[PDB]
Amino acid sequence: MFVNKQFNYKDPVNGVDIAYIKIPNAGQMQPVKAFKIHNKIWVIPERDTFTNPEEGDLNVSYYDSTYLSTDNEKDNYLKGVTKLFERIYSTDLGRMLLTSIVRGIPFWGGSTIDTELKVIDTNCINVIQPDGSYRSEELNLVIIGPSADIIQFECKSFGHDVLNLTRNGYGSTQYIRFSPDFTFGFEESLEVDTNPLLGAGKFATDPAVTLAHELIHAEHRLYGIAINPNRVFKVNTSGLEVSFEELRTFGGHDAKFIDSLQENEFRLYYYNKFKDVASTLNKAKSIIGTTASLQYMKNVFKEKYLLSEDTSGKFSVDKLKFDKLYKMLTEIYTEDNFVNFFKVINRKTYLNFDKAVFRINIVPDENYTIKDGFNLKGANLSTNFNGQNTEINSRNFTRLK
């Protein structure tokens, strides 16, 4: 259901959901073969050597310039990523998260003429057709291979000359450098109430959790309510800094590092930002790039932001409607609640730096399933979290660094 059709890397482009594309801003990059696995979501099975110029080559942290270079790999990569989305989507939470994301079309704040609505083309990609013509397409999310540092997973946008799209409520297309071929090991934090009967050795993080973690960053950013990367907490451990955004995203006890005073400050801030958006739509009397109507566009953002529209068509931000949306996005969609749903083991806090990288392969149903992840049912790997025991389930994990 979430991805409706089998995509093989070697399938012929068609100009619709399989095509060579170009990421505006990459400039003169050569086209890359991407796949549209869902409305507003694409996957590029390449090592990210485009989003950032300074990182044009693939020359704890893992490096391998040869990684994800063969079509066969790109294939397995496409299937892994797809499998995880399905896994995330199979949970109500994930179903909800993925829904918010598709609805989070980055806002049309490209105009300098307050009475005009206009796209910000860094939120589009050029889809090359079979004839050779290109077509600009809007998209909310792109999943791409990692750059030089294979285990450096992040969420990145293209920013604006003046606007802060990820923090002004507008939003922007998000590019998640991620890989389903690796996972991290953490250590069974043994506490009085923790199950004593826990396998042995270190466990591996369920890759679905890792992806979820990023889609959460992607949600915040798409709705332009991401916490400034500068706001951090000096955790007592000298003193280590950790961004509020990360703590928020991880959720759980870590999210409580953001005191009530900060919470209200952020909530009132973006409430105000959303209001400006409603206000902008109201002043809007014309649109540019007409393959679509003004009304439709206004409605699309009414839906995204959950604005209220009076009989005269005037939009407005309803305080309790906002509260729900904003809460859902920042308090309900957290790594911790995903661990609750997946019922898998994961580090208890964002603070768990444990050197351990394993090459994995969740594509085979013999190793990983949508519903059980590594803790396969009938299998024996489904208890005390055996599936995630790099010892007990040694065959699914290959140490690297």
Curated annotation (Swiss-Prot):
Domain-related comment: Has protease activity.
Site feature location: Transition state stabilizer: 350
Record-listed Zn(2+) binding positions: 213, 217, 246
Organism of derivation: Clostridium botulinum (strain Kyoto / Type A2)
Top-level lineage group: Bacteria
Compartments in which it is found: Secreted; Host cytoplasm, Host cytosol
Functional summary from the UniProt entry: Has proteolytic activity. After translocation into the eukaryotic host cytosol, LC hydrolyzes the 197-Gln-|-Arg-198 bond in SNAP25, blocking neurotransmitter release.
Record's protein name: Botulinum neurotoxin A2 light chain
Catalytic residues as annotated in Swiss-Prot or TrEMBL: 214
